[PDB]
């Protein structure tokens, strides 16, 4: 039996140690560039659960959904300012750390304030098992999307797909 909660927070910590594992490999290796596209491969998909299925059964909390939505627009635009540096610049991993600390202050600020749902949210452990299957099963659909994504067009057209 799995919920909606559970699916989140197992994919954060997909998300994070993906960031651990970037973070401890050389910078401008074949494992971290690896890795890095791993990382966005995730990141597209949890964003994309968020919006399209977790965030519209909070709706109720219309001042934190505003904020939730905020802070992933803070995440895409760090990392459209990341992607500006390439790893074998110089300033480039102050510009992985800003990224990484952005993406993780926010995931820490969604298992503050929207999990478990805020009280303004009526949902009950049936409804948020049927969302938990909706989203697990949504996630496997949008990895394949974001993977045919990066295969077939590469890097730039799944960041610009966020
Ligand atoms: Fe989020
Ligand atoms: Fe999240």
Redesign the pocket.
């Known amino acids: 039996m799995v919920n909606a909660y559970e699916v989140?927070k197992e994919?954060?910590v997909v998300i994070k140690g993906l960031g651990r594992k970037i973070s401890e490999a050389p910078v401008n290796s074949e494992e971290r560039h690896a890795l890095f596209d791993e990382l966005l491969i995730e990141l597209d998909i949890?964003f994309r659960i968020?919006d399209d299925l977790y965030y519209p059964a909070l709706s109720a909390a219309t001042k934190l959904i505003a904020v939730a939505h905020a802070e992933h627009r803070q995440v895409i635009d760090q990392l459209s300012v990341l992607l500006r540096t390439p790893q074998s610049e110089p300033g480039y991993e102050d510009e992985w750390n800003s990224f990484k600390t952005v993406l993780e202050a926010?995931?820490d600020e969604?298992e503050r304030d929207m999990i478990p749902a805020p009280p303004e949210v009526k949902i009950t452990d049936a409804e948020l098992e049927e969302l938990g299957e909706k989203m697990a099963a949504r996630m496997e659909q949008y990895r394949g999307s974001a993977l045919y994504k990066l295969r077939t067009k590469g890097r730039a057209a799944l960041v610009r797909s966020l």
């Open positions: 989140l994919h954060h949890h968020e926010h995931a969604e």
